[PDB]
Amino acid sequence: IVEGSDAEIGMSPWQVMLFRKSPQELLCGASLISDRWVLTAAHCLLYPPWDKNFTENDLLVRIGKHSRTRYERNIEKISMLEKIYIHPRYNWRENLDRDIALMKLKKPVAFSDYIHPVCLPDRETAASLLQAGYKGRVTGWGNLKETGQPSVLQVVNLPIVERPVCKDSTRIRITDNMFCAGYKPDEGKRGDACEGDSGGPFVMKSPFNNRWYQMGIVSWGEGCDRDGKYGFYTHVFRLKKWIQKVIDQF
């Protein structure tokens, strides 16, 4: 996260770290949506242009974390993966359309002050809150600048951007399964996700019921915190029927 701040303890108790077993390293962010399901970006798990195609046994998820590199004894919990599910129409060939995946944990994780699931939006919460200018929050352990790494989880709040502005900022084809967020050059304030944040959540706190909802997944960008560029996020609500189908079936 560029131009963010240190998270407070327990500020993002749904935040998950996707961790490569060997070599041991941060792969991506992710989010906890129940005691046994974790949501992330498909490109965190499958991206053939970069020879990326992880299997369950290659990875762990670390839940309840604050420090990036420390083993947070008595606080974090480490879970193995039972099964990875990639959206069947995830478009890794072109523009990362439908950049979403689920991971089922081998065993349920115990909730605590540091570990708690985020809500997924309903149609009405999405319609109300997914509006240009409305701010969400992105969290992660990714790089602090494009060209370095944080001691603890970082947080930044960013406004959703009007779709024509998102479209006009890039040559990549945008779809209805994406939204973009970030400040405009004339707005002064700055901030973005960066390498290592992808797969993590873009959340909004509903003013109707005071619950946090995951509206987006950190999906793609062109640089980090560049003027006139915006971060792109998977539109979680648009893909929720697939999430539900997977959870109901498996």
Partner: peptide, 28 residues
Amino acid sequence: EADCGLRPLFEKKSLEDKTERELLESYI
């Protein structure tokens, strides 16, 4: 889950975090 999105150290205690107000102020 019925308790989703309510953080133990914040909403469950009626404590706010340092920047959530910025989000609320944007929901015009």
